[PDB]
# Entry
Amino acid sequence: MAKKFTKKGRISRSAGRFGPRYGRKDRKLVADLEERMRAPHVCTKCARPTVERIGTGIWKCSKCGHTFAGGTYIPYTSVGQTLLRTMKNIAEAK
Amino acid sequence: MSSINYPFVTEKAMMLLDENKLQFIVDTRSNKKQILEDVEKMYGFKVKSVRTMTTMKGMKKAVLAFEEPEAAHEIATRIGLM
Amino acid sequence: MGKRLISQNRGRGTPTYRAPSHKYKADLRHPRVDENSSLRGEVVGIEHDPARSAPIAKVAFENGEELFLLASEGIAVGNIIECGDDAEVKPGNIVPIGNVPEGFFICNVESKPNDGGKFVRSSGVYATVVTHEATRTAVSMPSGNIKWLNPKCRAVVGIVAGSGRVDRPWLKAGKKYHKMKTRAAKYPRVSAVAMNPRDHPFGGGAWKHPGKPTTVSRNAPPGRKVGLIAARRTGMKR
Amino acid sequence: AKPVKGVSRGRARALAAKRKYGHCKGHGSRKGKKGARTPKKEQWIKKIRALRRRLKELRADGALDKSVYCRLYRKAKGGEYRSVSHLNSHLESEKLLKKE
Amino acid sequence: MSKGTSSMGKRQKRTHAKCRRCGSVSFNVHTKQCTSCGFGKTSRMRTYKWQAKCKY
Amino acid sequence: MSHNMKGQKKRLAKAHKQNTRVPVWVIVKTNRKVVSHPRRRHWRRRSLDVK
RNA sequence: GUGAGACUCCCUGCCGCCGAAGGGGCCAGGUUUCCUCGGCAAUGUUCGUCAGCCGAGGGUUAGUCGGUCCUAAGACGUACCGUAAUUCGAGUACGCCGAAAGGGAAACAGGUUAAUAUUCCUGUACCAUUUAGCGUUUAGUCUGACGUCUCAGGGCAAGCCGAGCGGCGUCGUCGCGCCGUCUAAGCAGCGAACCCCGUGGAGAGCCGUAAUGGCGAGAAGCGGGCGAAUCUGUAAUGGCACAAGUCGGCUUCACCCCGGGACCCGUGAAAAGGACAGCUAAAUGUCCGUACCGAGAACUGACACAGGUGCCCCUAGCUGAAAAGGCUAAGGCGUGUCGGAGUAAUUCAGUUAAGGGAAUUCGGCAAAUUAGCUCCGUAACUUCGGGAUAAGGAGUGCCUGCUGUGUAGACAGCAGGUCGCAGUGACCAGGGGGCUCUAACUGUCUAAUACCAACAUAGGAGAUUGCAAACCCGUAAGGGCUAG
RNA sequence: UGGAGGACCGUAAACGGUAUUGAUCUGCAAAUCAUUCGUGUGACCUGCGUCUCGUAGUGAAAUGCUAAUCUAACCCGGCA
Ligand SMILES: [Mg+2]
Ligand SMILES: [Mg+2]
Ligand SMILES: [Mg+2]
Ligand SMILES: [Mg+2]
Ligand SMILES: [Mg+2]
Ligand SMILES: [Mg+2]
Ligand SMILES: [Mg+2]
Ligand SMILES: [Mg+2]
Ligand SMILES: [Mg+2]
Ligand SMILES: [Mg+2]
Ligand SMILES: [Mg+2]
Ligand SMILES: [Zn+2]
Ligand SMILES: [Zn+2]
# Structure
């Protein structure tokens, strides 16, 4: 279903395009960022894992076309989640 | 300030007398409309178009294609080119 | 006259240090609203702003004035934007901070009333409304300063979109080169110790060193105020 | 105007006929990398198009219903078959056609 | 590549055109000013006291 | 094929017709005391100060 | 032959150079160098009857090609304001310019001259504006109008193959080799993908693509609409020795249409113009450029300069991965403008050199070795990406006959025979490895003695500043950073 | 299968200019030629346009470059 994750080759991940350059720390950071960004994201409207990046901070649900502005690499940031749940508590409590 | 100087006669300029055309040396400041109007005033013959060009000697050569037949030969005879 | 610093060249305003102003989408500011007035509008599209490397929302209001807006996080297409004091405290809304409950996050804050938004505009930054008083209101800015602002200073609720942009390491001089193409900044920058003594205060010598203390006074003239300008302290946290 | 003395091509045509038969093409004449003489993506393209066309014709004439045609299509996607002949031999081995 | 005859074959363009007001090839094509008479900068003709010597 | 306007071609025309020798009768009339002028030139030399 | 005068000019033949540039087209630039005639005092690295020279005369024709029009980076003007003052200065408001390679209303084939040609002539067209007749707005949108990489489908120039037909070459024997067998815009018609609409009802899942994918928030299937390049028909008489002039097939780039995907802390221009209400008639379509070179002789470097501008855009057959290199077309040339002579030393650049093989030298400097492709195999160390073409090896031609994949071009493979010292037979084309120092790496650098360990870099850290800020420019008006 | 990379090999495409301390050094050339070399999908090369300049500009920083001129250009003037 996926690539031949070879007996040695699941360390570089997507950052094997950089070859041996740029050191292990920066390659690890960029590989983790690509893994976090490329994962499926459930849309808030249609609730289907279809949200995908279109630009720097722009995300779009492929099914319902719900285009929204989020993080540069992650759609929903934890601070925005904190703000939304704070307003949710304020609306529920009163 | 006449636009017409004189008819232009070379071997190539006399090659168009059979074609009803007649090539003139005109004032370089003039345009096609002024050459057409001044030729029609000077000889009365009607002109169909004007093919103008400026040469490297500092002059302008105009070729007037007439409408009535034999107007080029008539003008050449009246001027004495032929 | 030893040669003027890079800061003096930048202040003179030469093409090397000028921003490519034609590359940017639009100046970001809050819509102009008369006092005791309001306007609604809907998002017609999320675009990309080269000036900030973050999304900006194209908002069509009720008077038909298509105005680019700074995009808070979570704003989408077809959302309704509201302005004025009567506007509900909701993410993406433009309201005075005097109506915002304490503890909320705001961004694109105005220094003065009807300012257009000065503070809290980078990708992901936010401010916290701390306290409410009759003539004042405290907002905890992204730096950390408890700035005191007027109660009528508008601000859009929510954190600025594009959070996490600096999380990715640059990883390559070409990537930062391509970012700095659309910027006003000079890239790359030569270290001052590598310069000759005519060019910088710190240049010259048989070996790379300043030769003088890098902490410069606040009362230094232009062309001398380099290094650590007016430092309270130096070094890592011992 | 004197005649054009164009480059003759009879020896070239003789060599082309021999090459068409399969000769004059050994490893001493191959000078370019295997991948320039024949690209790999074109080989995949022709192979998968032949396999999908054979499966489409089998599903069209009723010899291959949708339940096994879908599996065979995904198998041809996954590279289980080497050619149309290999697909036919596997079909006649595991009997995926609706023989009646 | 050199600074001498190698890079002097790139002189296929102009920086001064023939000025209207004086007929001299001194009209800069970028500043729009003739550097001999000053047409395009002033109504008067540029003339300076250092163009000749002190008369004493 | 440099693309001249009208005045540039007029200036090149005057430069072209300046580049001709003195007539023979001028030399004969002047007792051969006028045999040249400064405007003689060749195209494969110092370029024109025309355009 | 010409000429008084011939290595040097002209014709013929032979032998040659370039042939992905030394050929073809044109920007900037040159400015008549273009073409015909007549000369050789100077120019030409010799002479010269020759000539980009000297002298005389001639040559450039536009509604359709460009400029013109539009706006971009960005200039300039007027006013305000500043300045001792201005021809000086930032900003603002109103204008105006800014691209012969961005946007863009429209023309093609053949002929003609010594030199002009999508311009002149023949044929067949098309575009715009205004005037008149006949009626209407849909008027707010679309187009103009967009980056990089990668790829599918369709078409086509160029190329190639088979049959017939017409000429030329070869013809010691053979029956082959070469050339040609042509047909534009405009007008009329069909329309592949994508998109939209009407039905449809798919899950112990089905439909697809090269690949990603799509689907009850409605897939497959069936219809319909919108819709390309090209193709077909006409233009059908033009040119071809009025000689054939008719056919089939393959391939098709780097050209055109169309669609998909991926990437971005890069988001990849604007405006004029154009479409949606036009149809018919007539007249008008001014001005500028148009020759010629575009470079080992027409530019620039003092020059007929081995540089640079231009390798900026195109370039046929064979070999071959190839536009590499070699050999040939077409085309351009024998002008990278001195000849005879074959007799030393020495010298610039090459070929070969017994036995030894770095003993030379500051130092393997130079030269030599190896070299393509397929297959086997590949170590230390490592940031797990690499090192790696590591290293170390085998095969390779030609002929006879076949097989497999593909729709096809073509690709891959096998059996037997056979020649040579040698089968990537020429051309083409890494020598390899180990241990240290230094810098992480790609990059940048003393144009004209230093391509380095220096500079930059990502990474790390520190400092100032809450924006009427920090920092900086200006005498000021006012500005850069900052559409932050 | 896929087609990422300041990835690799590589041209007499383009750009650069290592070594021969070869040729040349009153040269083809006021720095060029031959062979040998580095980059050659990007911090790339380059046409045209436009802008930044003298105690000033530009500089991946050598006091390099700013018209064969640079630890302060060039022209005229102070200057006999
Ligand atoms: Mg004209
Ligand atoms: Mg100092
Ligand atoms: Mg005086
Ligand atoms: Mg050859
Ligand atoms: Mg001589
Ligand atoms: Mg204009
Ligand atoms: Mg280094
Ligand atoms: Mg360093
Ligand atoms: Mg390379
Ligand atoms: Mg210099
Ligand atoms: Mg002096
Ligand atoms: Zn959704
Ligand atoms: Zn002037």
Remarks:
- Residues 1-14, 30-33, 38, 40-44, 46 of chain E lie near RNA strand G (CB under 10 Å from a C1').
- Strands of chain E lie at 16-18, 25-28.
- The CA atoms of residues 36 and 51 of chain E lie 11 Å apart.
